[PDB]
Coordinates of C-alpha atoms in Angstrom, one line a residue:
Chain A
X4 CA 41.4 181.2 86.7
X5 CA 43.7 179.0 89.2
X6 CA 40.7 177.5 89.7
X7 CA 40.3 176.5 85.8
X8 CA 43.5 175.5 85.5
X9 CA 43.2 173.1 88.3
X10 CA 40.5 171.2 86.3
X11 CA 42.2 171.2 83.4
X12 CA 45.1 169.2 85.0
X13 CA 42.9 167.0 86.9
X14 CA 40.9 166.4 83.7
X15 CA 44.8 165.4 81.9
X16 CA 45.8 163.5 84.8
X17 CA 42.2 161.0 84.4
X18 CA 44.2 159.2 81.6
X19 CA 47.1 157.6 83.2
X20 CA 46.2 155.2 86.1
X21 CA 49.2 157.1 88.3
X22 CA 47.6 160.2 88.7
X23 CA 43.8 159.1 87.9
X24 CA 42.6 158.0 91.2
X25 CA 43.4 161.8 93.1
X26 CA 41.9 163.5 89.7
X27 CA 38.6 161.4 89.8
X28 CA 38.2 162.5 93.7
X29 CA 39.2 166.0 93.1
X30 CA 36.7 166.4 89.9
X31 CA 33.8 164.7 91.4
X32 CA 34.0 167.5 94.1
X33 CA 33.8 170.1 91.4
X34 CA 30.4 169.2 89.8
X35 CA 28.2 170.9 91.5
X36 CA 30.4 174.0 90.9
X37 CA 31.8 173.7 87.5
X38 CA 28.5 174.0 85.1
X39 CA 30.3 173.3 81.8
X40 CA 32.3 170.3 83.6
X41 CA 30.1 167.4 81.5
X42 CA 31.3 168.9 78.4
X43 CA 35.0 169.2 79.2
X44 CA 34.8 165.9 80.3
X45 CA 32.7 164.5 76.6
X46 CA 35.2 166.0 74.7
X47 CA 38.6 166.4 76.1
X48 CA 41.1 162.9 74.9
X49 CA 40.5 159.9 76.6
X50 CA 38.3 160.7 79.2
X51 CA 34.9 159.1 79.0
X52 CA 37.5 155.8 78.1
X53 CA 39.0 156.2 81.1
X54 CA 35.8 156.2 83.4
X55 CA 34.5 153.1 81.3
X56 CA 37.9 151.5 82.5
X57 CA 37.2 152.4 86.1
X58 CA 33.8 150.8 85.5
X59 CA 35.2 147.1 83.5
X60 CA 38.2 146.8 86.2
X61 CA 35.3 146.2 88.7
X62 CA 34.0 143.6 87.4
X63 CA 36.2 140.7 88.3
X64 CA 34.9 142.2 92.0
X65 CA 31.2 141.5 90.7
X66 CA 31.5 137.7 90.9
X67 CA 32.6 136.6 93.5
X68 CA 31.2 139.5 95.8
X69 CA 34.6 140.9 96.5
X70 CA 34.2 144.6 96.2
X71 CA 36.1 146.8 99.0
X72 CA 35.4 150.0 100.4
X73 CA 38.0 151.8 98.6
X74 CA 37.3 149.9 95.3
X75 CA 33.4 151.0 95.5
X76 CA 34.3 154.4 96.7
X77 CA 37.1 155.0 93.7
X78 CA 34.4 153.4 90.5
X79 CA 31.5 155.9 92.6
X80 CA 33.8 159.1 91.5
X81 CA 33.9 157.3 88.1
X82 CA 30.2 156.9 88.7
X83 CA 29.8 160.7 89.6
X84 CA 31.1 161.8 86.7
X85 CA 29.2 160.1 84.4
X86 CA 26.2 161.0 86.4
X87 CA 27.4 164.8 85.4
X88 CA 27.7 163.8 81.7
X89 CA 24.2 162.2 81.6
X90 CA 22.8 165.0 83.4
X91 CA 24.5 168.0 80.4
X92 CA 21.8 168.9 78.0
X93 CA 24.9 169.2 75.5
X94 CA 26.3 165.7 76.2
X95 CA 23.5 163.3 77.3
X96 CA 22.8 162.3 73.4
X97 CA 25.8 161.2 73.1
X98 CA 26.0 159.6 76.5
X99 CA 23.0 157.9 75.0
X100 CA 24.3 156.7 71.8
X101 CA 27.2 155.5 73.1
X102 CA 25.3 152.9 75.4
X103 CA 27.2 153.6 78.2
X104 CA 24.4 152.4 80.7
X105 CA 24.6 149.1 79.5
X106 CA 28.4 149.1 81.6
X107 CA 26.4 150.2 84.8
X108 CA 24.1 147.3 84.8
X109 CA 26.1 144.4 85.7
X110 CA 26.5 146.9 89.2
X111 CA 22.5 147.2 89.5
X112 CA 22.2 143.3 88.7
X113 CA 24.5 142.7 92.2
X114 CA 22.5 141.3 95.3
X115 CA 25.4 141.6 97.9
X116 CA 24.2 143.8 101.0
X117 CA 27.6 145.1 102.0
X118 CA 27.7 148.7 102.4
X119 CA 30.5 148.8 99.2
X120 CA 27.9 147.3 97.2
X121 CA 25.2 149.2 98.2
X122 CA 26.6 152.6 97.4
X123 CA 27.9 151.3 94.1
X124 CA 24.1 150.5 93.6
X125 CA 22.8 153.9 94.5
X126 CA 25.3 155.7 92.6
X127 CA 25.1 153.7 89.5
X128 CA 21.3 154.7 89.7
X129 CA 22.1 158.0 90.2
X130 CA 23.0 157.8 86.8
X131 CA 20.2 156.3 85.4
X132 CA 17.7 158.7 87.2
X133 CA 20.0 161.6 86.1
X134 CA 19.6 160.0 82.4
X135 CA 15.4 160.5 82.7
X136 CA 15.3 163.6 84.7
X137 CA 14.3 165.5 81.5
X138 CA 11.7 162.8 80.3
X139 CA 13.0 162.0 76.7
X140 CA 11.2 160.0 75.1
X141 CA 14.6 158.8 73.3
X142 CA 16.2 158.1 76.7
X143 CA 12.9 155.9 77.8
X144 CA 13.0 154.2 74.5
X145 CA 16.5 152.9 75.3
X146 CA 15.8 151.9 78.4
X147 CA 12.5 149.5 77.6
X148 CA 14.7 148.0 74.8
X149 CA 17.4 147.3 77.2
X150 CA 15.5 145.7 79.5
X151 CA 16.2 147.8 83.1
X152 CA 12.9 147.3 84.2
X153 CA 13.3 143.8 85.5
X154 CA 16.9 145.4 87.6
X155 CA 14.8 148.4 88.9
X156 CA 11.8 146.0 90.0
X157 CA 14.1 144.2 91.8
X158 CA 15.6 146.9 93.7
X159 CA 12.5 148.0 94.8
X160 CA 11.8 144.8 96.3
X161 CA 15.0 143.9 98.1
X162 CA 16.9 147.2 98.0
X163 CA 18.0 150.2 100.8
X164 CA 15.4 152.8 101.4
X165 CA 18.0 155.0 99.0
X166 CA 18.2 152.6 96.4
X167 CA 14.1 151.7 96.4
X168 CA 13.2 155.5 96.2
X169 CA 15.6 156.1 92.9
X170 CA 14.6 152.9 91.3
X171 CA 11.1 153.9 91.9
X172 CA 11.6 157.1 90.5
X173 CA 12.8 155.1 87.3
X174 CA 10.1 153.2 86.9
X175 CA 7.9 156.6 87.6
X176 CA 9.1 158.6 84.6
X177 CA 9.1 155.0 82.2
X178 CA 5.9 155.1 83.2
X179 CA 5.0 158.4 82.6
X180 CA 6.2 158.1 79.1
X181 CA 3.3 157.0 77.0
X182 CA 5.0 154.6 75.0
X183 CA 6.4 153.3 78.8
X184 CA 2.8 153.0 80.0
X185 CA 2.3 150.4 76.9
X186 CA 5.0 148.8 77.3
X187 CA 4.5 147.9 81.2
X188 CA 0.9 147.2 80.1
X189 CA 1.4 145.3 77.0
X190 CA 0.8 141.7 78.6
X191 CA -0.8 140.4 82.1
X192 CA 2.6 139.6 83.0
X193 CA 4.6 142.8 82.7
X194 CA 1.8 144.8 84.2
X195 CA 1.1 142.0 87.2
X196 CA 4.9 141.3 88.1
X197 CA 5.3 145.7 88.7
X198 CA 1.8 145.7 90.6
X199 CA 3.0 143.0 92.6
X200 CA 6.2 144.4 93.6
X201 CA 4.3 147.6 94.1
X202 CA 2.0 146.0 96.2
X203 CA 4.5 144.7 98.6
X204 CA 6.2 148.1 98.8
X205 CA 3.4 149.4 100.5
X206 CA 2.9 147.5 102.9
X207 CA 6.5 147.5 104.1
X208 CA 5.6 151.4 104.0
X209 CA 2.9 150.5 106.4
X210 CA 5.6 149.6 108.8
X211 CA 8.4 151.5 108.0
X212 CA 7.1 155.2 106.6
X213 CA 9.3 156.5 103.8
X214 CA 7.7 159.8 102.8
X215 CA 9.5 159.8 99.3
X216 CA 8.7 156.1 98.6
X217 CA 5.4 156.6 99.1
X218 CA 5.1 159.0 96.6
X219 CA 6.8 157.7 93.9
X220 CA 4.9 154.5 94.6
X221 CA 1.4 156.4 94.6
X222 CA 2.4 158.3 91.3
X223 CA 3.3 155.2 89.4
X224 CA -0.2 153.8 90.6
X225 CA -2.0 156.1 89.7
X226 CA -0.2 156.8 85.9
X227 CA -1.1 152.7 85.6
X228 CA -4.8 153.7 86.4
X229 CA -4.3 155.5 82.9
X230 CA -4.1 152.4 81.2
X231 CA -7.9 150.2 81.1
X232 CA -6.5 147.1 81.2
X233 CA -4.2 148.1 84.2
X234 CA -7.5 150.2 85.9
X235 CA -9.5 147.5 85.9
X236 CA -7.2 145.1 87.1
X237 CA -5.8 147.6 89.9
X238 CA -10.1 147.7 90.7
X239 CA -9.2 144.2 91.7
X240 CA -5.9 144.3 93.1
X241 CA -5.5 147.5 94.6
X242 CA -3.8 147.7 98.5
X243 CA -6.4 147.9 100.9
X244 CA -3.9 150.0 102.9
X245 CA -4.3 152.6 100.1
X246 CA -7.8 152.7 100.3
X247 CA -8.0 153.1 103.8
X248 CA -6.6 155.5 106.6
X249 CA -3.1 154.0 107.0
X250 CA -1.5 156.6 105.8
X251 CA -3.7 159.4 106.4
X252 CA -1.8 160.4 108.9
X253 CA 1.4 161.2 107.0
X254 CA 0.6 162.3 104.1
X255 CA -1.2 165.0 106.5
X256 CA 1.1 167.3 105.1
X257 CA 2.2 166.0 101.8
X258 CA -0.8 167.5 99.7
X259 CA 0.9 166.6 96.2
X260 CA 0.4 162.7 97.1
X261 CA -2.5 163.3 98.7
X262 CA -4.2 164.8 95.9
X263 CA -2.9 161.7 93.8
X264 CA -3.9 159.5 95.6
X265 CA -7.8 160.5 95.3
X266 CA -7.4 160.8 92.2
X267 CA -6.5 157.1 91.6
X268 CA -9.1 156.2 93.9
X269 CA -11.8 158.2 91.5
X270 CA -10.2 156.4 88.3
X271 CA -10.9 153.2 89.8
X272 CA -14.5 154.0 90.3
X273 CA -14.5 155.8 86.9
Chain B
X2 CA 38.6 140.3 92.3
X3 CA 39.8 139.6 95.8
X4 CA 41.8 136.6 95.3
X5 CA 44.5 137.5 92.7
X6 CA 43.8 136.2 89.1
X7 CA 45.1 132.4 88.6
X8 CA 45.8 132.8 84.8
X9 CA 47.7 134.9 82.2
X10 CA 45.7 135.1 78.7
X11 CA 48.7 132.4 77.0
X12 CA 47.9 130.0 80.0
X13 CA 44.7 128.6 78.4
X14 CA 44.8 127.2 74.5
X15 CA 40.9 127.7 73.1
X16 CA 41.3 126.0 70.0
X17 CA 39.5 123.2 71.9
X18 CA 37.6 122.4 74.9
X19 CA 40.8 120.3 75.6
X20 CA 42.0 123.1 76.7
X21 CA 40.4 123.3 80.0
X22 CA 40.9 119.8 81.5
X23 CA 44.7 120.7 82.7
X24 CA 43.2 123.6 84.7
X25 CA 40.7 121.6 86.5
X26 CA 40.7 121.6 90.1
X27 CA 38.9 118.4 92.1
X28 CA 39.4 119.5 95.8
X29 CA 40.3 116.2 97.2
X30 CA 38.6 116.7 100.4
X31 CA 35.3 116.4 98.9
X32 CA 33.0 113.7 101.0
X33 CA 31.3 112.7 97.4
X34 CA 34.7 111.7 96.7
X35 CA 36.0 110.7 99.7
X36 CA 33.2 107.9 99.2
X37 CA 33.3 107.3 95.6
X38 CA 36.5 108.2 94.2
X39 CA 35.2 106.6 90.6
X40 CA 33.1 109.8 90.7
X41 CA 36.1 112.1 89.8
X42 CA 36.0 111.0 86.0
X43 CA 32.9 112.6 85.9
X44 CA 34.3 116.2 86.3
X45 CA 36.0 116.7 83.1
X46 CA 32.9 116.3 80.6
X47 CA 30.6 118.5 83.2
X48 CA 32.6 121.2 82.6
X49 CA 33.9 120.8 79.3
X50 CA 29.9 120.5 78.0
X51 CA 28.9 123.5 80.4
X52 CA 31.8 125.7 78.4
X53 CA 30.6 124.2 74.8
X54 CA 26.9 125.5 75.4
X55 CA 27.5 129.0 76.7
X56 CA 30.4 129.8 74.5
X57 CA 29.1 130.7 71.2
X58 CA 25.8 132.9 72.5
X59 CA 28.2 135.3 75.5
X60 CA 30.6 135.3 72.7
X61 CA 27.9 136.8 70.3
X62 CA 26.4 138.6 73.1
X63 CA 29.4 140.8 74.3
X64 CA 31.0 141.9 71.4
X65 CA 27.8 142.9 70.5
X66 CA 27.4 145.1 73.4
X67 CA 30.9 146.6 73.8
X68 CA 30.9 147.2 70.0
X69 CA 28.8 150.2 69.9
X70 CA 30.6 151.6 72.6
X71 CA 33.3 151.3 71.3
X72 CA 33.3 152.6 67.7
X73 CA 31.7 155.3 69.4
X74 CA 34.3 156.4 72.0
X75 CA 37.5 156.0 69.4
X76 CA 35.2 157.8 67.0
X77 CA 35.1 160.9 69.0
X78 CA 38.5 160.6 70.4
X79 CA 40.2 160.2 66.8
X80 CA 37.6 162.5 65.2
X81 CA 41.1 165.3 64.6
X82 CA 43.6 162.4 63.5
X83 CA 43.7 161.8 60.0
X84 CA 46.5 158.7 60.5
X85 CA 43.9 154.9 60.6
X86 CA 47.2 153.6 62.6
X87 CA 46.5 155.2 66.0
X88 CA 42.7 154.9 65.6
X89 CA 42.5 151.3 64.8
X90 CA 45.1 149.8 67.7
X91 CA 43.7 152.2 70.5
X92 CA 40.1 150.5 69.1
X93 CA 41.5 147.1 69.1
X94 CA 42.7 146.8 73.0
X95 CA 39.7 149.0 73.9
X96 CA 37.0 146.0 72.3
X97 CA 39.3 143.1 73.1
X98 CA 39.1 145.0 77.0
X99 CA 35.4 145.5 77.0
X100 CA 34.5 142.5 75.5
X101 CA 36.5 140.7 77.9
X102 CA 34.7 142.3 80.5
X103 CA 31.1 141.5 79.4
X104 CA 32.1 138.1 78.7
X105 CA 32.9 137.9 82.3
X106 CA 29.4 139.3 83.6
X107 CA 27.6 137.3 81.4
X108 CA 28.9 134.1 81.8
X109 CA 30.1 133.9 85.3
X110 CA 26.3 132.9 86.9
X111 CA 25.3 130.6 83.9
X112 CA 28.2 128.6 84.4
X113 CA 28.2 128.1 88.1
X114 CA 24.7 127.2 87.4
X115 CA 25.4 125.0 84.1
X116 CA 28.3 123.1 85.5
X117 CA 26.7 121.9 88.5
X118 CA 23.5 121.0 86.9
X119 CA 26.1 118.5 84.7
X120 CA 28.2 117.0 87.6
X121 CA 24.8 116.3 89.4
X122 CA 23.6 114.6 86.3
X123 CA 26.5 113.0 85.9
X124 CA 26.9 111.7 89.7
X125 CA 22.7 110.6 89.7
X126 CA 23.2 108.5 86.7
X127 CA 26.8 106.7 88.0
X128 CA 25.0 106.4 91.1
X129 CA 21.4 104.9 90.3
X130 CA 21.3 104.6 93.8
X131 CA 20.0 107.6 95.3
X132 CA 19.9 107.5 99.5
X133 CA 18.8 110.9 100.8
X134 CA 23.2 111.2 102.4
X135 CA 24.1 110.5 99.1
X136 CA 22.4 113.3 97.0
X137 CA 23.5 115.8 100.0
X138 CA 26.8 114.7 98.9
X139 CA 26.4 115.0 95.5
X140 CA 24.7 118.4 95.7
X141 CA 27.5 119.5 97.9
X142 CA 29.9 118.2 95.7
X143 CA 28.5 119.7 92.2
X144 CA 28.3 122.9 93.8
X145 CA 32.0 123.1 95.6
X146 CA 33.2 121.6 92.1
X147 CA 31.1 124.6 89.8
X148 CA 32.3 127.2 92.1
X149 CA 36.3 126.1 91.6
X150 CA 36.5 126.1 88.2
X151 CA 34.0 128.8 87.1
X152 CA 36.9 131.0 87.0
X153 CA 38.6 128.8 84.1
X154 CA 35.9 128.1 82.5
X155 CA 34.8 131.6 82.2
X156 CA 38.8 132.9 81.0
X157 CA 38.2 130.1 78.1
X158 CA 34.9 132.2 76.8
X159 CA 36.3 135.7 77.8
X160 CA 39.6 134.0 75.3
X161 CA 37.6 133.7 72.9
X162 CA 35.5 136.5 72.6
X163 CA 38.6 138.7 72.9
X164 CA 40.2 136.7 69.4
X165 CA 37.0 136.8 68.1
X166 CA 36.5 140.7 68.8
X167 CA 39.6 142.4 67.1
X168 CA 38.4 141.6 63.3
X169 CA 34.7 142.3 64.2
X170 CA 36.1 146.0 64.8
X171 CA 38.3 146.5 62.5
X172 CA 35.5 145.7 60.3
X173 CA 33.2 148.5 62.3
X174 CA 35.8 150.9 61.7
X175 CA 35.7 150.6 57.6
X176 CA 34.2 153.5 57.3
X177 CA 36.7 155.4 59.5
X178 CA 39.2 154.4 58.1
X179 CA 37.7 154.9 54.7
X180 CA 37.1 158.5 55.3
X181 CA 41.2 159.2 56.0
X182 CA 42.3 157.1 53.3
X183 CA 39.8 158.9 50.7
X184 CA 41.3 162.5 52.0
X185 CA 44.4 161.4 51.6
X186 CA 44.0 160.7 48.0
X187 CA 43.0 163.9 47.6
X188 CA 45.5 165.7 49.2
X189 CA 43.4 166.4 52.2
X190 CA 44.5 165.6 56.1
X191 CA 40.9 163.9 57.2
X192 CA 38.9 166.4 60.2
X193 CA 36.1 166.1 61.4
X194 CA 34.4 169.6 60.6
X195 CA 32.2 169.5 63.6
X196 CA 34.7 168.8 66.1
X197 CA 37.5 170.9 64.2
X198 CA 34.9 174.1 65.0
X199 CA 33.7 172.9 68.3
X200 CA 37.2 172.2 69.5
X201 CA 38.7 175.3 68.2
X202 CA 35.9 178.2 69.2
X203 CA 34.5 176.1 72.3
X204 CA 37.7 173.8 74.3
X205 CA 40.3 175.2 76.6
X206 CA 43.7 175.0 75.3
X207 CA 45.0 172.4 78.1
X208 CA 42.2 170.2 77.3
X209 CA 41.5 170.7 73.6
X210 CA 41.8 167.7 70.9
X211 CA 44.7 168.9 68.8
X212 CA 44.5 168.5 64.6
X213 CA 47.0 165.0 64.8
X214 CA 48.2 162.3 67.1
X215 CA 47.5 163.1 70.7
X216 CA 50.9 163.7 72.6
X217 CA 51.8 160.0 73.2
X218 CA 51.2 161.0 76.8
X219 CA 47.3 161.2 76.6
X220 CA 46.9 157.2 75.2
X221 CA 48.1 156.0 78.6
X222 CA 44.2 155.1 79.2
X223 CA 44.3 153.2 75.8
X224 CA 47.6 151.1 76.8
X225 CA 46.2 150.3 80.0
X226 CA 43.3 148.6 78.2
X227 CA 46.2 146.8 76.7
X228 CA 47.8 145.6 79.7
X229 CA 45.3 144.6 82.1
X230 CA 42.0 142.7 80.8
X231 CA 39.3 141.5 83.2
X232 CA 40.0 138.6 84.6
X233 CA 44.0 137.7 83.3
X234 CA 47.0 138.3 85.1
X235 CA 48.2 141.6 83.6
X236 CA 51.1 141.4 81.2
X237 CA 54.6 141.9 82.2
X238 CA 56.9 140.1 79.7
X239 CA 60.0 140.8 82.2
X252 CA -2.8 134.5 81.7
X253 CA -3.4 137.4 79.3
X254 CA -5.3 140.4 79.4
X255 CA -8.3 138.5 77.2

């Protein structure tokens, strides 16, 4: 109960900027213990506010690339806790319908390779992939209209291994989504511009082996081999490096991939 | 940012584009200049017509993305106070703030990119001569020149869509406000029946929305939006498929 009550006052103390910055570090080290945290946080006063504050009084760090350590490391806590909230069954609708993404994507539009803006990157995807995790069709729906697909494909060309392994897994559940799959497929462009990208993720995978990335890479081919414009285009532009043994060896052990993979390969052929 | 915010929100006057040329900065040291001093007349028009295009559409553009946000924040924080007052002001500095700060975002690369697009222009055609030194210099210039006035350039749009943003959400906010003057008429103190139940049977006491204003304590986040908007000097006042 001194537990609770500890919560409680770090969940008061989030609305004044004197006492917000220890509350935000103390609560974002409680949400993997505190199951109904997301909803204390919805719906106590001021709270989701104040986290949109943390978020807007980064910005002016944006652009110029100024961001600190300690700046990046204070809006990630911000950033944790609205992970939490889009992760709640109870309070990810409203999450939804209150756009708050769209204040997260000025972060994932940043290019800097600083290690401040790195980890405000992977933690402002964290949010995003928390968002999808469930596969709602209302949450993929948002995201095609608001145009995150071109800020995830971008990632997963230029990004950290971290970063190009969640922005991956975006793009794996739009795709999964059958009104995703259409929309990705809808014109030459969309569908060429993500095969590209794809394309020259594996063969930096070739050369620097990331288990993970491989197999969101090989899922997302294969749920575009769905699609018959995107199969018999893939029949055309399809990695040779997929086709042959380059990464037989490890995926040795990784049967789930494997087992995707041949199954692209027979769609192709199909 | 880094480098501490050069102006307060009164500095810069919006009405018009005359607003900006006081706030121009021509770093002397320039070689373009250095060369052709002439050239410095250019500066004032290149920025003044890189403001005049971008201003309406990330004026349009931000409000309309902090809007929903924001009706639907102050919606769920007011949902237990039947008074319009406290709604509508802690809704006004909360759009003015997030407007402000996705005018910022929005504009900031388009203007860099805008600007020195015009001063090159404007330097190719008062130089028809165009030596291969000359259009390093000119490049060089146009880009030093974008980069030191972006930030005023930007505070005049952010100005803007802050003025512009207060009336859009009051106008939002009818409704809400409809809904607590229509109780009142009736003798009723306006609650929001779902949250009265979910606040009563489901929140903890220390954290729960109370029927009424919020103890003037809990609106410090909403008086911080107040006080401290992106990008001012806070306030003191002391082929086809086929």
């Amino acid at each position: 109960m001194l537990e609770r009550e500890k919560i409680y006052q770090w969940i008061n103390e989030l609305s004044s900027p004197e006492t917000r910055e220890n509350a935000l570090l103390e609560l974002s080290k409680k949400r993997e213990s505190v199951p109904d945290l997301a909803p204390m946080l919805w719906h106590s006063f001021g709270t989701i506010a104040a986290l949109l504050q943390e978020i807007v009084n980064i910005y002016p760090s944006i652009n110029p690339p100024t961001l600190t350590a300690h700046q990046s490391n204070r809006v990630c806590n911000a950033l944790a806790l609205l992970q939490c909230v889009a992760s709640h069954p109870e309070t990810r609708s409203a999450f939804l319908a209150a756009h708050i993404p769209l204040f997260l994507y000025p972060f994932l539009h940043t290019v800097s390779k600083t290690r401040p803006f790195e980890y405000l990157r992977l933690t402002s995807l964290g949010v995003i992939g928390a968002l999808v995790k469930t596969d709602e069709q209302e949450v993929i729906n948002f995201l095609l209209t608001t145009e995150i697909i071109p800020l995830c494909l971008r990632i997963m060309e230029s990004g950290s291994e971290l970063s190009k392994t969640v922005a991956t897994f975006i793009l794996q559940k739009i795709l999964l989504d059958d009104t995703g799959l259409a929309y990705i497929c809808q014109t030459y462009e969309r569908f060429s511009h993500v095969a590209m990208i794809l394309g020259k993720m594996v063969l930096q995978l070739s050369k620097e082996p990331s288990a993970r990335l491989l197999k969101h890479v090989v899922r997302c081919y294969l749920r575009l081999s769905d699609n018959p414009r995107a199969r018999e285009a893939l029949r055309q532009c399809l990695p040779d490096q997929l086709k042959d043994t380059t990464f037989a060896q490890v995926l040795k052990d990784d049967t789930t991939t494997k087992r995707w993979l041949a199954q692209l390969v027979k769609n192709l052929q199909e | 940012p880094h480098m501490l915010e050069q102006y307060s929100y009164h500095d810069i006057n919006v009405y018009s584009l005359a607003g900006l040329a006081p706030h121009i900065t021509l770093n002397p040291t320039i070689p373009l200049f250095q060369a052709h001093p002439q050239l410095k007349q250019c500066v004032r028009q290149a920025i003044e017509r890189a403001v005049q295009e971008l201003v309406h559409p990330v004026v349009d553009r931000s409000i309309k993305i902090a809007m929903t946000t924001c009706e639907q924040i102050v919606r769920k924080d007011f949902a237990l106070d039947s008074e319009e007052s406290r709604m509508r002001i802690a809704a006004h500095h909360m759009m003015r703030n997030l407007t402000a700060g996705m005018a910022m975002i929005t504009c900031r690369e388009p203007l860099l990119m805008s600007i020195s697009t015009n001063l090159k222009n404007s330097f190719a055609s008062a130089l028809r001569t165009a030596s291969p030194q000359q259009r390093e210099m000119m490049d060089q210039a146009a880009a030093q020149l974008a980069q030191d006035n972006c930030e005023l350039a930007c505070c005049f749009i952010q100005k803007t869509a802050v003025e512009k943003a207060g009336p859009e959400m009051d106008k939002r906010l009818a409704t809400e406000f409809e809904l607590r003057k229509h109780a009142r008429q009736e003798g009723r103190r306006y609650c929001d029946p779902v949250v009265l139940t979910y606040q009563a049977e489901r929140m903890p006491e220390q954290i729960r929305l109370k029927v009424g204003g919020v103890d003037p304590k809990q609106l410090a986040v909403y008086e911080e939006f107040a006080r401290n908007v992106p990008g001012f000097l806070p306030t003191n006042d002391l082929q086809a498929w086929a």
